[PDB]
Design a protein around this nucleic acid. Sequence first.
DNA 1: AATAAACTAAAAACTATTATTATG
DNA 2: TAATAATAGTTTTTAGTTTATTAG
Lengths: 473, 662, 131
Amino acid sequence: YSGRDSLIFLVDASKAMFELTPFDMSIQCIQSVYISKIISSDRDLLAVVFYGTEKDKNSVNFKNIYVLQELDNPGAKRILELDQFKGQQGQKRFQDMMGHGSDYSLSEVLWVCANLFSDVQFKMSHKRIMLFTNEDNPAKASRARTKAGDLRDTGIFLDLMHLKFDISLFYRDIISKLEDLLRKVRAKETRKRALSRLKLKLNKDIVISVGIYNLVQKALKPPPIKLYRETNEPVKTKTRTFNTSTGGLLLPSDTKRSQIYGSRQIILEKEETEELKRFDDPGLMLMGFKPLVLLKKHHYLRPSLFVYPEESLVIGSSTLFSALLIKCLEKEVAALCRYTPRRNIPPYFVALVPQEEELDDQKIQVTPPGFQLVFLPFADDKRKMPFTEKIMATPEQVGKMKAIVEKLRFTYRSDSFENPVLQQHFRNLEALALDLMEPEQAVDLTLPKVEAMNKRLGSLVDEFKELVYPPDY
Amino acid sequence: FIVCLNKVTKSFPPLADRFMNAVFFLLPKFHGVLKTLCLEVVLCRVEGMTELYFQLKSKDFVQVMRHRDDERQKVCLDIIYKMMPKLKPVELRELLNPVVEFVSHPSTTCREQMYNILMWIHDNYRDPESETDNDSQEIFKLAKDVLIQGLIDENPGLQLIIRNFWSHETRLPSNTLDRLLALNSLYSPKIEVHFLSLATNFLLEMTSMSPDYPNPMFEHPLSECEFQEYTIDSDWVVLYRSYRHGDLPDIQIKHSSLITPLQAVAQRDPIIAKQLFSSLFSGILKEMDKFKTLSEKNNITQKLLQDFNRFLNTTFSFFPPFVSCIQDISCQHAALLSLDPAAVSAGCLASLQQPVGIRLLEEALLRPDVLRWVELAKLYRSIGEYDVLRGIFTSEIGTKQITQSALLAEARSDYSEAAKQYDEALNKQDWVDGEPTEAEKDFWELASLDCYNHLAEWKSLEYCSTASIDSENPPDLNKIWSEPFYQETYLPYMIRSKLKLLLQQSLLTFIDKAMHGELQKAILELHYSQELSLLYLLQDDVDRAKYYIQNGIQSFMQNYSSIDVLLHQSRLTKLQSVQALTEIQEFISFISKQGNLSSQVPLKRLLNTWTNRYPDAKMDPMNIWDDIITNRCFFLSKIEEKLDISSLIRSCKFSMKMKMID
Amino acid sequence: CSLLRLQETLSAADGAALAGHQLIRGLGQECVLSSSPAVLALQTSLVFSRDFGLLVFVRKSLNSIEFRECREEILKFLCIFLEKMGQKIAPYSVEIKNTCTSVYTKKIPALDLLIKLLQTFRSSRLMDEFK
DNA sequence: AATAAACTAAAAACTATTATTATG
DNA sequence: TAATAATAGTTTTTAGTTTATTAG
């Protein structure tokens, strides 16, 4: 989906930033937001265009407006522009070259904002404007309120907090908690493109699209491009199956794919090579229903994803899936599907465990109404060790470890942990922009936390040792 | 949405009064025909925008003007037309500055619309009464000039209504006298070719009010018979005289019946146009001769002399008919005999109308006088009145001897020792005349240059170009040196010197400075295009040389058409440029046959050809000797090399020397 | 002339993105202007085919998205010269093919340049077939 | 004295265009 | 005997092919 929220930094200079002075904290807010945006989305554009200025620095050059980093993909440019002014000395030098609080017409700055939002040429789902003031800064406002309402009609959102929820009295009508904006949000990729929906062969006469969009799945380090070691510019990396016995690059008419099986390399053709990958057709070929009791769940270990419908290709996606998930309550089975994302794919036996919508009070689409992919394993990959079940539970031991650990009851917030590599290197990119150290470390909480406080909660496994040797080493 | 909105705004303008923000939030987002529909909506409800010039600030009216669409551009012009009554004059000429470049476009409809804009401005906003700031005066100058160029619309109706607009007593005051005065102040620096024609048109169309001009001049036919309109076959001309015809000669034709064909031939034939203009102007002078105050007369003559300056100053082709008309008009009138001798000299020289200005200056002398004398001497040298020139430099103003001994050298044509005398004493200013006129000083400089151009001393040609001149300018010259007028005179010699030195670099510097400013390039191609052709044919960028040679052929043809042929010396000098033009053109055309280009069969048989077709200097001036020598050497050096041998080339050098001798 | 100096100004303009936009605008204007068969226009377009090198190297020939539209425009003008008003095919074809190979080296108008070269091989066989 | 593999290896995304058959 | 129509096309995140030592 093309379309995002375009945000501009329209910050007032009415010395409502200069009373810590609100300027420094506002600049920290905007820099943290830009740090989030550079590591999250370049599709969203950031405009460092402040008003209330002693200068008329803007496109139409209206009263008390300054442009620093207009609407653009986030980057270190705005980071350094705000970094040179974030400090109190930065604030005073800022007030020197930019200006102090001055008079102007709010219609002027709102017109400039309208020009900025109408000059970008991106299909943009939403538009937002942020603004900071210590208190309500205020004809001068009636035209301003009219223009702000019109911009709101154009999909532009207005954001303002008074840094005195106490004193914005003259701005209550004008207006349409920044600790979250202090980089609480950070490093979340925004892509909305993914594979075409697969065709569920639920039966032999009607097939229904299923929405499998890998758009908000795992995100990691940016693309490492083989830049030149001297000037930091990429290389083309001319690579292919090339020849030394005959020289040059082998042509497709001269390349044959084989399989070294038994005692020989079974030479086949490329056509057979890549057409062998298919057993049938693309889509979710449904065999039937498999009771959830027959899941190994010690082999449901690979990267698993969700199975959602898609009411875009067939009318009956939403209809039949709504009925199916309505009747999933009385079923202990899963939609036994074979999975081919495209043509020439080996279908995988998939059990569709019903994961219906968790519509909360606000109906947040947590676990959206559909199914979750249950792994039906095979016989080639698991690190199996020989089983040993001569050991059962003993009441003393079970009670002792229960009292040791039962206090620590978590809730398993699925996104609670932070990926080490991803956030690590993203904030490291932040530091590279800042030209500084390794900023901070990300980890999948892999350092245990209970072991330092299990005895604080009354651990008994440490207290009760089954052997003079560490009972479980 | 926007499509149906542009569809309904014409269907109902008031409905557009709820979506100004919609279009303004989308106009710098709408760029296809969406932009066109936005223009439609804006135009239909421009009154809906009290202030929308700030849209132009934000929506980039200029970039829309870059787009090519009579639709888009024209409706933008119409929007301005709606809002230029409310437009601020500063914003008005701000918007004018990108507009003026659009004149003369093949659209002729958006072109017509912007010409309506220009006339509207000159009527009520750029009008001569709203001239309170340099803003307004610049706007009015631009508008008057572009409407002057609108008098000549290929649309006869458009230029006709433009003529009506002008001739209107507001634009052009009704009285023939003050109409004439406005015409004298209305000339455009580019219309002197047809300025006289259009002025005659306006003057004669005023006579329409004369309630006898449409009447017959005769009512008493000597031979009276039936007079009915006569017919004529016109198989693939429109009548201007109906031919009320019969057995006997009528004389009861209308004054109009003659004047209208007369006006048409005047506006079509430039030479008869200027003759008629001079005659009518003189008759107007007799009209003021009745009882009019001489104070007004001398004021008119003063402003007319100023107008003549603004003509000669702002002209660069120096239209030989227009120049001659101005010269004679000055001739017949003492208060008009007050011309700058230098100005009339330059006009004659650029128009090849030397003798007309010679007669004018003769009347001026027999009427400063020293400047008049020196200008007459300059033109006498240019033509060759070296006898009267001897008389003048021995009696009138010539008290020196280096000038006179160099005069003997030039009459003996051995310019060598003439330039020796001059470069000997040209930097020193003390003389028997005390300080000789700076005209005589740059005359000595030009004589040294004419020597070192006459001789093959191109190295000393550049040397006397640079240093041997009086130290009134740095040695080398470029566009930053055109401001001194003597340097302008030297420019043909400058190209000659540099081109021959390369044939043996400030030249290319001045060439690019000549493209920098199309006036420079236009003058160079008018007067030195063949030199450019020879240069860039030697510079091996021969496509540019071919470009220059075709432009030079056209310039030669047009100049010879414009420059009077009855001045047989002027026509002969014009046709002396034939040799180099044909050289470059035919060598480029024939160079496709490159087989006989380095071999010796274009050498053994065609080297003696170097020095076979050589004239005598009496019928071929020896500057044209240098011309044709360069031409033939270029021919038979380029055709003998770069795909009998050496002794033959030396023999041809030697024979070229004897022909120089003869 | 007006065409030569205006195109030179457009090339000299080559922000880089805005420079590309104004270059494509001016080139579309000249394309809808260059529909003239006069030999003078043919000669001026010829002599400015030499300045095409600077035109495309201020375009950087880089397939850059800020000058990818200029590539479209120059190829559309080449399509204007695809028909035989470019009577003088000899003096430029070799440097033209070398330059266009450079432009493709350092999208769709690259294929358009290939089509131009194929047309030259159909018309300007002599010097092009050697290289 | 040879078993151990998470160091990436590829494909739809609505962009949008042409191309219709616009005419006897 | 002369407009509107579809390959027209993309900022393709997993084909599931590299990191990982007791076999002698």
